[PDB]
Design a binder for this molecule. Structure first.
Ligand SMILES: [Mg+2]
Ligand SMILES: [Mg+2]
Lengths: 132, 101, 144, 120, 197, 138, 100
């Protein structure tokens, strides 16, 4: 039996979100993609470069915001601009959020030579789609 | 800080192949024609053989840039099949979905 | 028959953006644009507003300090056309030779202590110093 | 002068206000060069030293040292034709290839003398 | 003291009659605290309802057209109308356009995403001209057709020249014009070896 | 009440050179979402109608690129997992516009182009015969 | 195969459009082919194949030492190494040959 990115059943007290509860065969049927770019299009290029950038950005954000991210990240590219959208918690103080946001945006912009803009949506707790 | 010594050697081969690349092109141009005298072509053959081994472009292998897997790698994304499937199933690859028809 | 070709109008590279900006108007319910648009992240008072901006500026300074301290991690151009601002910053006297040209370099870099010490060493060496360079050094010392 | 530069900075400071909207941020990015200049040209910021089509293509002017007759001329005609058809190379490197062939033939003139060929 | 409490969403402060283009000036990620729309997205669970906009990652994963409302589009076009000229009235039909401008130039610009914008496909220049417009007699017409070969389509009586050797689009355009000029001049020119036809 | 009293309109300067004439502009947008393309098409059509540009929109046939990979990590060649990438095309052809109008329209649509959508714009520039080709001097 | 008029017309066309004037053979045409395209080694895909793992590792290592990046994997490795040292299994130093 397949076990690719599937959250298996449990006692029933395990909370899951919409993204992690849906199996990969539901992609483009019930849930969309976590990253949008023109690399994976007919005639376009730099698909490998976008993939490497996306992987590094997700790891960088995960380590830069420990215990903050609730769900996955939404990465968008429009021309030269890069948009990183994250759903975070509210445990940390706003001063720490603003300090990290300014530091992360500046560091990523200089590293990837493109304007990087970070947007945060704070939630009281991790949203539970269902209990598996 | 690369994945393994095999990847490190491949990087060195790519660097040494990027260097001496124009020199190989110029010498091989002499070797790949019948207009030039045969003695000059043989000298060009000796020169290109005396060139460093790692500068040969056929010693470069398209390994995975995540797990250093020498085979099962898609060239468009430069990823091994297992890493590519893992990212695709998670949904981190744009415009990639399961094929059903 | 003759066709009348209209003259080519010209505008600045930001003229369209300025026109689009003029279309929209100031909104009242919104907070200042510098802050986030999240209910938890939006400032509540003026003191919170100032503190959040200072924290964000502090983060930018920390990021800039890291970039300047470790330029080698960001020396990889991947953007075309080149973006000079998004590059590592260098503020060091690369030319270590004791000469007028390197002294002028330190004057441009605004290294007051290095420039005056180098000027003293140059004077002790006996090599001539241009009047313009001396005046430039005085301007740097007077301001700092 | 330095004082005038600082005076200009002070004038910028008193005329400087925090960004008020996304359009202003895009305008600032465009002026700073961080953002592209729409419409997209796909060639902005790239000039091959202002060279023209005749300089890029017609490279026969660089074969003056090379003999105009013989197998060497035939080989160089092939090389120049390939360089002219190449779109990924600049004029500087195209000449550099010709310079390398001229130097190589000069070094190997003795072999050419054996094969009854004269270079330069 | 208790943890900092998030303020109520500003949609409450927003009124029914509002300048929505001002609320969403540019393209921005979806914000439930700023969008006064009770939009739900997500596949419902058994005896369930689609997830609310708060914390809905699926809504965030949609490129929103809030900044492109019809009112905003009309206002933006009205401001940008000052930047546009008027097409000539005499060139009413394509026949008149062909009559006054026999030469047509085709080039392609590509819009991509990423730090780099360079694209080698932007150097291709296509020049189309009908040989009927060109001042060609019998000898020049026949010689030009033989020289160009497959570059000329007899059914459309159109000569098409594609230039991609030059690195720059302007250089390709200059080379294309130069090729057309030399082809025309050489076609009109008569050579002695042509007598052996 | 707190509205700006005066607004500084962007400066538009008319040069002395004739504007470039474009016979037809073919704007082809590639994407993975048909609804996004439909929304972008409606936005582009509305903008063209407001600016008075004649525009025709049609849907080129879609392309699907499929490939297969091993389902497992070892000794399971028989079982495969198949992936695909769907590229949907939408072509908007605008005719009888000048260079200035085309430049403004392109800049407006490109800035409003959503993420994950590629645009290819094909030009059709009208030109006269060159001076050298006017008459057979040779 | 072709008449003299056709041959000279074809040669004139080759001169006009930039092709090789002389009647070369297939082997000799490789000289034109080699210089008409970038070498595979010189292509950007070849040398810029791997990302700079030295940069992507040292930069994160510097950030972690500066207290701006938390690595769960590195914390796991450090904790396991500390526990092994407490248990007794410590890494032998270079030049300390247990078997020697
Ligand atoms: Mg099975
Ligand atoms: Mg191999």
């Amino acid at each position: 039996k397949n076990r690719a990115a599937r959250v298996r059943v449990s006692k029933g007290d395990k909370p899951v979100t919409y993204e992690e509860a849906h199996a990969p065969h539901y992609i483009a049927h019930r849930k969309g993609w976590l990253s949008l770019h023109t690399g994976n299009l007919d005639g376009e290029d730099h698909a490998a470069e976008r993939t490497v950038e996306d992987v590094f950005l997700r790891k960088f954000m995960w380590g830069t915001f420990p215990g903050c991210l609730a769900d996955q990240l939404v990465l968008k590219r429009r021309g030269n601009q890069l948009e990183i959208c994250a759903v975070v918690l509210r445990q940390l103080s706003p001063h720490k959020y603003y300090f990290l946001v300014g530091y992360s945006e500046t560091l990523l912009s200089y590293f990837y030579k493109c304007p990087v803009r970070l947007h945060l949506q704070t939630v009281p707790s991790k949203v539970v789609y269902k209990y598996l | 800080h690369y994945v393994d010594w095999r990847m490190w050697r491949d990087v060195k081969r790519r660097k040494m192949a990027y260097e001496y690349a124009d020199e190989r092109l110029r010498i091989n141009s002499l070797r790949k024609n019948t207009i030039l005298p045969k003695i000059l072509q043989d000298v060009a053959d000796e020169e290109i053989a005396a060139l460093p081994r790692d500068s040969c472009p056929v010693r470069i292998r398209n390994r995975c840039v995540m797990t250093s897997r020498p085979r099962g790698v898609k060239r468009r994304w430069r990823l091994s099949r297992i890493v590519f499937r893992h990212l695709a199933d998670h949904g981190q690859l744009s415009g990639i979905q399961r094929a059903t028809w | 028959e003759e066709v009348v070709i209209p003259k080519k109008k010209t505008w600045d590279k930001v003229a369209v953006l300025q026109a689009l900006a003029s279309t929209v108007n100031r909104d009242t319910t919104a907070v200042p644009y510098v802050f986030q648009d999240d209910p938890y992240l939006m400032p509540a008072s003026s003191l919170e507003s100032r503190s959040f901006l200072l924290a964000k500026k502090s983060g930018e300074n920390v990021a800039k300090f890291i970039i300047n301290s470790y330029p080698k991690y960001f020396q990889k151009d991947i953007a075309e056309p080149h973006i000079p601002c998004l590059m590592p910053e260098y503020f060091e006297p690369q030319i270590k030779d004791i000469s007028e040209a390197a002294l002028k370099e330190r004057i441009e870099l605004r290294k007051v202590k290095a420039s005056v010490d180098m000027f003293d060493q140059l004077l002790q060496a006996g090599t001539t110093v241009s009047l313009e360079t001396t005046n430039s050094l005085l301007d740097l010392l007077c301001y700092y | 002068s330095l004082w005038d530069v600082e005076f200009a900075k002070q004038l910028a400071t008193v005329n400087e206000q925090p960004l008020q909207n996304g359009f202003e941020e895009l305008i600032q990015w465009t002026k700073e060069g961080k953002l592209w200049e729409f419409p997209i040209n796909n060639e902005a910021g790239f000039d091959d030293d202002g060279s023209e089509f005749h300089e890029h293509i017609f490279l026969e002017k660089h074969l003056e040292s090379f003999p105009k007759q013989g197998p060497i001329r035939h080989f160089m005609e092939l090389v120049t034709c390939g360089l002219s058809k190449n779109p990924y190379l600049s004029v500087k490197q195209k000449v550099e290839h010709i310079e390398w062939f001229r130097n190589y033939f000069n070094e190997k003139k003795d072999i050419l003398k054996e094969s009854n060929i004269q270079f330069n | 003291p208790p943890r900092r409490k998030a303020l109520p969403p500003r949609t409450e402060k927003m009124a029914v009659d509002q300048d929505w283009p001002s609320v969403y000036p540019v393209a921005a990620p979806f914000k439930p605290s700023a969008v006064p729309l009770p939009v739900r997205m997500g596949y419902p669970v058994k005896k369930g309802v689609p997830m609310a906009k708060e914390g809905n990652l699926e809504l965030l994963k949609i490129p929103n057209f809030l900044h492109l409302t019809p009112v905003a589009i009309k206002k933006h076009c009205e401001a940008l109308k000052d930047f546009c000229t008027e097409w000539p009235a005499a060139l009413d039909s394509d026949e008149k356009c062909e009559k006054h401008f026999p030469i047509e130039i085709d080039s392609t610009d590509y819009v991509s995403s990423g730090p780099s914008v360079r694209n080698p496909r932007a150097r291709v220049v296509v020049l189309r001209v009908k040989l009927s417009s060109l001042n060609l007699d019998d000898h020049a017409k026949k010689k030009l057709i033989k020289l160009v070969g497959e570059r000329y389509c007899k059914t459309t009586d159109v000569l098409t020249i594609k230039t991609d050797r030059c690195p720059l689009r302007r250089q390709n355009y200059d080379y294309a014009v130069y090729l057309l000029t030399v082809l025309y001049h050489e076609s009109w020119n008569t050579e002695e070896w042509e007598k052996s036809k | 009440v707190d509205v700006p009293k005066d607004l500084t309109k962007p400066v538009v300067t008319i040069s002395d050179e004739p504007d470039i004439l474009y016979k037809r502009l073919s704007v082809l947008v590639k994407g993975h979402d048909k609804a996004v393309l439909d929304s972008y098409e409606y936005f582009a059509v509305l903008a063209a109608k407001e600016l008075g540009i004649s525009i025709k929109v049609h849907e080129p046939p879609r392309k699907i690129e499929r490939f297969t990979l091993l389902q497992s990590v070892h000794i399971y060649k028989k079982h495969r997992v198949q992936y695909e990438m769907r590229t949907l095309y939408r072509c908007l052809e605008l005719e009888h516009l000048t260079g200035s109008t085309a430049d403004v329209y392109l800049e407006y649509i490109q800035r409003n182009l959503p993420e994950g959508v590629a645009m290819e714009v094909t030009k059709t520039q009208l030109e006269q015969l060159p001076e050298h080709i006017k008459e057979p001097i040779w | 195969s072709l008449s003299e008029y056709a041959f000279r017309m074809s040669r004139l066309s080759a001169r006009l459009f930039g092709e090789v004037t002389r009647p070369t053979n297939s082997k000799s045409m490789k000289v034109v082919k080699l210089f008409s395209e970038l070498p595979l080694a010189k292509k950007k895909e070849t040398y810029d194949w791997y990302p700079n793992h030295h940069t992507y590792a040292e930069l994160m290592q510097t950030l972690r030492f500066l207290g701006l990046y938390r690595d769960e994997h590195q914390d796991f490795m450090d904790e396991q190494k500390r526990l092994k040292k407490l248990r007794g299994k410590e890494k032998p130093k270079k030049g300390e040959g247990k078997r020697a």
